Amino acid sequence: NVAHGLAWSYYIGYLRLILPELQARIRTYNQGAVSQRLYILLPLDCGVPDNLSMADPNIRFLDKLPQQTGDRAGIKDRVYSNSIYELLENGQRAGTCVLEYATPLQTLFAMSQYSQAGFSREDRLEQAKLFCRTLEDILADAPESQNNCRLIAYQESFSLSQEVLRHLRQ
Amino acid sequence: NVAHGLAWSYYIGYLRLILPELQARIRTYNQGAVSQRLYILLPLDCGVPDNLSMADPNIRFLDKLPQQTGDRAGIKDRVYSNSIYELLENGQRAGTCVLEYATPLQTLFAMSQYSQAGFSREDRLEQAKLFCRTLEDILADAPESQNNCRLIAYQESFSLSQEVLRHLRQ
Numbered sequence: 001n002v003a004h005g006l007a008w009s010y011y012i013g014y015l016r017l018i019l020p021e022l023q024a025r026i027r028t029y030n031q032g033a034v035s036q037r038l039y040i041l042l043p044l045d046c047g048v049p050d051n052l053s054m055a056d057p058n059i060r061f062l063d064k065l066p067q068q069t070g071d072r073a074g075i076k077d078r079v080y081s082n083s084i085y086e087l088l089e090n091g092q093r094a095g096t097c098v099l100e101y102a103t104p105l106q107t108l109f110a111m112s113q114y115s116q117a118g119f120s121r122e123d124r125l126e127q128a129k130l131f132c133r134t135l136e137d138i139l140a141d142a143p144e145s146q147n148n149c150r151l152i153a154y155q156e157s158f159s160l161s162q163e164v165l166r167h168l169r170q
Numbered sequence: 171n172v173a174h175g176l177a178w179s180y181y182i183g184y185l186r187l188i189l190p191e192l193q194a195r196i197r198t199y200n201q202g203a204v205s206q207r208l209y210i211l212l213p214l215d216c217g218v219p220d221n222l223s224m225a226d227p228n229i230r231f232l233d234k235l236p237q238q239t240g241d242r243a244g245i246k247d248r249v250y251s252n253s254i255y256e257l258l259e260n261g262q263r264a265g266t267c268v269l270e271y272a273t274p275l276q277t278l279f280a281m282s283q284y285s286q287a288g289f290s291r292e293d294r295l296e297q298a299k300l301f302c303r304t305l306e307d308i309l310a311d312a313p314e315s316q317n318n319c320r321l322i323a324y325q326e327s328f329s330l331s332q333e334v335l336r337h338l339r340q
């Protein structure tokens with residue numbers, strides 16, 4: 001239903017555009033090294049806090065990648081930026097990677113709360129699971145995703161940093 | 171159907187966020203003046219060229235507004251930028267305004283071409299008309315839209331610059 005559209009919008013408007021020019025931006029920042037893949041958190045509870053340092057203290061913002069720009073729909077130099085986070089484990093730099101949330105989930109949440117949107121608060125977990133399934137099916141035959149993307153879906157004590165680290169070691 | 175989701179995504183992810191901080195960015199650039207409203211082109215043929223200077227030569231890029239940033243879904247300083255265009259009429263500066271296309275239309279087009287998206291090329295005109303209707307209904311009770319937004323839907327000789335100018339003089 002609704003999630004299907006957002007997942008294609010999330011691919012045609014973002015992933016399809018920044019994933020090709022992604023390793024260049026990492027190989028540029030590198031010159032502890034950063035990992036070559038964009039890690040997309042996919043909480044099925046649709047809990048997307050803007051500050052990534054609140055879901056887990058062991059997730060530390062480090063720096064930004066070099067910006068990417070592109071004229072898009074009449075906006076000269078529309079710019080895509082991505083935050084580099086390092087993940088701690090017992091006070092130890094255990095990883096470093098470009099980590100971010102899948103914004104469309106935050107939209108599904110913020111969309112349900114509105115009355116005029118006709119979107120129930122109970123469907124939030126199904127649309128999330130439909131957003132991940134539709135997204136992973138897209139990336140499954142995505143030439144833009146030439147092994148440079150890692151989807152991290154999860155539900156909920158819990159350690160998000162351990163969840164990202166687990167996918168890092170692979 | 172699909173367009174309904176994109177229109178709420180287009181409001182919760184963009185309009186709801188930049189429209190409040192919009193007049194400040196204009197009143198800042200001003201200090202020929204720029205108009206206080208964001209003008210959103212809504213072509214029902216879903217023809218959204220990235221370079222706005224191609225649909226009409228009398229639409230001239232002028233400058234960018236001051237950027238807006240906000241931590242969004244774990245991206246430190248995600249930045250929203252908006253291009254200032256001036257519109258010519260018989261080689262005469264006839265207007266100046268922050269003019270842009272509604273990117274989700276460009277998505278509906280680029281979404282139809284994919285086979286895995288299950289979106290026909292014939293539904294493109296209905297989903298466009300559903301995107302405008304759903305969007306204008308949102309802005310109709312949008313406190314964020316305190317008379318600072320102007321929707322410009324149109325179909326197709328034709329002069330886009332005349333179409334924007336017509337809404338400017340009101």
Ligand SMILES: [NH3+]c1ncnc2c1ncn2[C@@H]1O[C@@H]2CO[P@@](=O)(S)O[C@H]3[C@@H](F)[C@H](n4cnc5c([NH3+])ncnc54)O[C@@H]3CO[P@@](=O)(S)O[C@H]2[C@H]1F
Pocket residue numbers: 009010012013014075078079080081102103104107179180182183184245248249250251272273274277
């Ligand atoms: N500056 C700028 N200019 C014009 N339009 C903008 C815009 N900022 C938001 N919008 C409008 O909002 C729609 C939905 O926005 P939202 O955020 S809820 O979801 C996005 C997001 F998930 C992802 N995305 C793209 N850039 C990203 C960056 N920097 N960081 C993280 N995510 C990114 O792509 C989805 C769809 O993007 P669209 O462009 S197809 O439609 C977008 C677009 F119409």
